[PDB]
Amino acid sequence: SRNYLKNPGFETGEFSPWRVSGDKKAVKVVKANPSSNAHQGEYAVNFWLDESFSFELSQEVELPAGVYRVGFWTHGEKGVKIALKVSDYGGNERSVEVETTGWLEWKNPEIRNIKVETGRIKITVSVEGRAGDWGFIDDFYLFRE
Ligand SMILES: OC[C@H]1O[C@@H](O[C@@H]2[C@H](O)[C@@H](O)[C@H](O[C@@H]3[C@H](O)[C@@H](O)[C@H](O)O[C@@H]3CO)O[C@@H]2CO)[C@H](O)[C@@H](O)[C@H]1O
Ligand SMILES: [Ca+2]
Numbered sequence: 153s154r155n156y157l158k159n160p161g162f163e164t165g166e167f168s169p170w171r172v173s174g175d176k177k178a179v180k181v182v183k184a185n186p187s188s189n190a191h192q193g194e195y196a197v198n199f200w201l202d203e204s205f206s207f208e209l210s211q212e213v214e215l216p217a218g219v220y221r222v223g224f225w226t227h228g229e230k231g232v233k234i235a236l237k238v239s240d241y242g243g244n245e246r247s248v249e250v251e252t253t254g255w256l257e258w259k260n261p262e263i264r265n266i267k268v269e270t271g272r273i274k275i276t277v278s279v280e281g282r283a284g285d286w287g288f289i290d291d292f293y294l295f296r297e
Contacts, residue, residue, distance in 0.1 A: 160292035174207035191225035200286035223262030228252035228287020242269030
C-alpha cells in the first residue's frame with residue numbers, strides 16, 4: 153500500500169509536483185464543496201470552462217524495478233473524455249480511456265501489470281471537454297504489485 157506518486161490526493165491544496173499542460177485555466181485544485189466531490193481528503197482537482205477545453209496532468213517518478221499498477225478516481229458531466237497514460241517505463245505507452253456519466257458517478261481508471269525496466273514512469277491524464285463540461289479528479293495511486 154506504499155503510494156509512489158507525490159501529492160496523489162491534492163491534499164496540499166496545490167498542484168505541485170503535478171504539471172498542468174494545455175488549457176490551464178480550465179483546471180484548479182479546490183477544497184471540495186460538498187466534500188463528496190473529492191474521493192479522499194478535502195481536496196480534488198476540479199475542471200470546468202465556459203468554452204471547450206483540453207488539458208493534461210502529469211507526474212514523473214523514479215522507482216525501483218518491479219511490476220506496478222496506476223489508477224485514480226473521477227466523476228463529472230456526461231461525456232467528458234478522460235484518458236490515463238503511462239510511459240517511459242520500458243515499453244510502449246499504455247492507456248485506458250473513460251467517459252464520465254454524471255455527478256458522483258465515480259470512475260476508477262487503472263492500468264495494471266506495468267513492468268518498470270527503466271527505473272522511471274510517467275503518468276499522464278488527458279481531459280477533453282465541451283463548453284460547460286466539468287469534473288473532478290482525485291486519489292491517484294502508483295503501487296507495487
Ligand atoms: O450537478 C451539478 C454539479 O455542478 C458542479 O459544478 C460544476 C463545476 O464543478 C464548477 O467548478 C463550476 O463552477 C464554476 C466555477 O468553477 C466556480 O468558481 C464558479 O463560482 O461557478 C462557476 C459556475 O457558474 O460549475 C459547474 C456547473 O456549471 C458542482 O461542482 C457539483 O457539486 C454539482 O453541483
Ligand atoms: Ca483528495
